[PDB]
């Protein structure tokens, strides 16, 4: 419950930041560019923290089993239950990665290791380039 | 016109921003080339080293030259005034006009 509690508080503050950026964008007059950058960076790094913390506690979330309350009436709130129950993605993202995979399209493994060696080589090359010139 | 010193100062500054533009352009080409390098054709691999080296050497010496300019600012300290003579020069030209008026052989 502790992990889900931390997820709750962090997601609540993320939703609060979203409500903020919403009600300062809803104005008919656009504020200064710099305030928009500050709000963007803060909210976006907060989203990063959301992702990282959700990553950290996957085991606690998975272990939990969902069950409706005995006191909760489904006869009158079945629509509300179904609203939270449904999880299928929005369609546009679906065909989005479908076209993405269409465009992308032992052989695969050796290309994978070739990518490994290119990555390592590029990292070493840029380390050497940084070391070549004194930046301090 | 301005004294020459300001002229080469502004030339050096203009060179500075042109070098910055060249650095941005070379960043564009290196970002371009890395894409196909990730794609998997090794022909343009040698060009990558040259592009990276030229990009870094363009980034460094530009900042170095700008640092030299800001340093020049440090020792350049200590190194209507025209109005004080302005009326005088006006005076001069007016009398010149009178001369042109005074001589009828020069009014042609």
Swiss-Prot record, chain A:
Q: What does this protein do?
A: Component of the Mediator complex, a coactivator involved in the regulated transcription of nearly all RNA polymerase II-dependent genes. Mediator functions as a bridge to convey information from gene-specific regulatory proteins to the basal RNA polymerase II transcription machinery. The Mediator complex, having a compact conformation in its free form, is recruited to promoters by direct interactions with regulatory proteins and serves for the assembly of a functional preinitiation complex with RNA polymerase II and the general transcription factors.
Region feature (Interaction with TBP1): 1-105
Keyword Oxidoreductase carried by entry: no
Main localisation, per the record? nucleus
Q: Where in the cell is it found?
A: Nucleus
Into which family does the record put it? Answer: Belongs to the Mediator complex subunit 8 family.
Gene Ontology cellular-component terms for this entry are:
core mediator complex; mediator complex; nucleus
Anything else the record notes?
A: Present with 937 molecules/cell in log phase SD medium.
Keyword Coiled coil assigned to the entry: answer is yes
Q: Recite the lineage of the species.
A: Eukaryota, Fungi, Dikarya, Ascomycota, Saccharomycotina
Q: Name one GO molecular function term.
A: transcription corepressor activity
Q: What is this protein called?
A: Mediator of RNA polymerase II transcription subunit 8
GO BP annotation list:
negative regulation of transcription by RNA polymerase II; positive regulation of transcription by RNA polymerase II; positive regulation of transcription elongation by RNA polymerase II; positive regulation of transcription initiation by RNA polymerase II; regulation of transcription by RNA polymerase II; RNA polymerase II preinitiation complex assembly
The record's note on quaternary structure and interaction partners says: Component of the Mediator complex, which is composed of at least 21 subunits that form three structurally distinct submodules. The Mediator head module contains MED6, MED8, MED11, SRB4/MED17, SRB5/MED18, ROX3/MED19, SRB2/MED20 and SRB6/MED22, the middle module contains MED1, MED4, NUT1/MED5, MED7, CSE2/MED9, NUT2/MED10, SRB7/MED21 and SOH1/MED31, and the tail module contains MED2, PGD1/MED3, RGR1/MED14, GAL11/MED15 and SIN4/MED16. The head and the middle modules interact directly with RNA polymerase II, whereas the elongated tail module interacts with gene-specific regulatory proteins.
Q: Which UniProt keywords apply?
A: Activator, Coiled coil, DNA-binding, Nucleus, Transcription, Transcription regulation
Q: Which residues form a coiled coil?
A: 4-30
Curated annotation (Swiss-Prot), chain B:
Tell me the superkingdom of the source.
Eukaryota
Q: Give the family this protein belongs to, as stated in its UniProt record.
A: Belongs to the mediator complex subunit 11 family.
Q: What is this protein called?
A: Mediator of RNA polymerase II transcription subunit 11
Q: Which organism is it from?
A: Saccharomyces cerevisiae (strain ATCC 204508 / S288c)
Q: What is its main location?
A: nucleus
Q: How does it assemble?
A: Component of the Mediator complex, which is composed of at least 21 subunits that form three structurally distinct submodules. The Mediator head module contains MED6, MED8, MED11, SRB4/MED17, SRB5/MED18, ROX3/MED19, SRB2/MED20 and SRB6/MED22, the middle module contains MED1, MED4, NUT1/MED5, MED7, CSE2/MED9, NUT2/MED10, SRB7/MED21 and SOH1/MED31, and the tail module contains MED2, PGD1/MED3, RGR1/MED14, GAL11/MED15 and SIN4/MED16. The head and the middle modules interact directly with RNA polymerase II, whereas the elongated tail module interacts with gene-specific regulatory proteins.
Q: Upper lineage ranks?
A: Eukaryota, Fungi, Dikarya, Ascomycota, Saccharomycotina
Instruction: State what this protein does.
Output: Component of the Mediator complex, a coactivator involved in the regulated transcription of nearly all RNA polymerase II-dependent genes. Mediator functions as a bridge to convey information from gene-specific regulatory proteins to the basal RNA polymerase II transcription machinery. The Mediator complex, having a compact conformation in its free form, is recruited to promoters by direct interactions with regulatory proteins and serves for the assembly of a functional pre-initiation complex (PIC) with RNA polymerase II and the general transcription factors.
GO BP annotations listed? negative regulation of transcription by RNA polymerase II; positive regulation of transcription by RNA polymerase II; positive regulation of transcription elongation by RNA polymerase II; positive regulation of transcription initiation by RNA polymerase II; RNA polymerase II preinitiation complex assembly
Identify a single GO molecular function assigned to this protein. Answer: transcription coactivator activity
| GO CC terms, sorted | core mediator complex; mediator complex; nucleus
